[PDB]
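Page header: ASSEMBLY MODEL / two components / 621 residues total.
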Amino acid sequence: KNAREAHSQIEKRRRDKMNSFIDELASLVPTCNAMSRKLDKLTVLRMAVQHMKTLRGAANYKPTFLSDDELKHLILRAADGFLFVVGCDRGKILFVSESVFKILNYSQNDLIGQSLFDYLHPKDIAKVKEQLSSSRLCSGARRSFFCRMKCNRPRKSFCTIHSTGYLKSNLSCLVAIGRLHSHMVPQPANGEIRVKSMEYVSRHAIDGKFVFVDQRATAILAYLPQELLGTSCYEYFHQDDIGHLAECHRQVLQTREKITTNCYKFKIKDGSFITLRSRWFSFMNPWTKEVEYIVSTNTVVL
Amino acid sequence: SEKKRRDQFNVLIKELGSMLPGNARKMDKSTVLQKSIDFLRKHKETTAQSDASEIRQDWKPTFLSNEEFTQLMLEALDGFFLAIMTDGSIIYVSESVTSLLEHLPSDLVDQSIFNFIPEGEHSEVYKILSTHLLESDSLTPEYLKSKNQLEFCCHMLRGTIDPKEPSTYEYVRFIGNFKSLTRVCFVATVRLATPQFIKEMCTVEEPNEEFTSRHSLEWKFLFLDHRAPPIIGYLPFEVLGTSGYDYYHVDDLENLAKCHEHLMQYGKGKSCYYRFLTKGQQWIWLQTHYYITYHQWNSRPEFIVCTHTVVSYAEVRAE
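Prediction written out in full:
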């Protein structure tokens, strides 16, 4: 009716305005906008409410007062290195963050789809392969290792990258973060404040040959483990220290007590020397009554 | 049916509006939709014009949850989350703090952060915290404003298992922002400057995890059951024939040897708490029950059966 008319025009105008709002809203929502199929108004509204939850919504692994977006920015601002996902089967790089270009000087496009092994130092392909062999991120799924990866523009065609990640699954893959660590030690500990010193553990056969070295050793001495293993500790000691050290060696074989060496110089990979101090003991296997190895805790000295 | 869709619609609109910033709580469907569109839009605009280009960078793969990406990144970065009132009172801290600084979250929460920073560094840090005060428009999220972003370095006391060792510090870097609460606090990712490549796994994610091995009379692995790989990473063939002692933490060797002597003597035993090196280069804390199996006919020792329990850092430290 004529009377009801003006009112039903207010109704149609409010309805059209509302629908246009829902369409705009939908275009702003990633989830909604993506879908090719048209969405129902109530569903666009539900999805928009959930997205809005991730932005301002609404403690397990994050404080209750932070939204998901807040947590994301908080983490990315602190981020370093690059994330990569490699297929365990064939070693194919299924993904890599653009930050990789900063590290290796390769872009995402360069790497995605390639075989990870084409970008490793040949002497590392095997070790990394061992890492990909498979066994809410569980301790057993964790992988962590150094290797040398090819840098685009070069003696500097490789850089030592440490990767920390977990094996993940229809396809099994490694999701990891690779970081390029700075070797040298700036901010040498101040006098006022007792700071924890850097250390690494090595184990040695009776005659001094490296039979084990821990991951921290690559960080400190720049050698990869396979480079030290099977070689004699005496190859690395500075000649002025060889005498003293051999004397501690001979002594440590004669006792079950810990022996602490004097400071000494150790030749790292670039041929320079750092200063270490080691605490040694000959561990005896109580089942065999035989010395299993000399266990050495090596502390970097300022 | 129209009343049901109208009511569900109203519920959605009211929920949407409740999430809207500002003092005024607008109820008008139209107003709420307008303001929600404005918010999402200012958020795309801001996240596209931010200072840190790292926030726009492609980092996390779609198939990876936020939770897992956060755990992974924090591990890789030797970092934990920390939220402290401008007062200096810690109100939140990530579980990973335990593997990085050897404090339990309960040691930190409801405590002053200054108890963990050398006194010489107190005033400066006080400044950082007290100085910055900002008012945020409803339209623009506080954490998106450059003025609210901040980084600074200082030392933080490490916890310990033995009180004897002298107080020892880690140089760390706070990367965080100021945020308002329903007071004002500073929330940050705290990263250790000294990379930690090998750390202790301080919580048993599973309610309880357990696995079995058998060792020879030389202490070499002879058996590792199907429960072990999801815990320690290694498949049996990777450790079989290798000495158990290769996997123990240096500081535990001595004690473990003593336990084994006791075992050789009595035929049964329980180890002290000790650390075992997983394939992924984490120390997990274990406690092991042992017994020697003897040959059915000649009665000589044949092998040792070991039942390994994974234990939390809280239990190890408690005693």
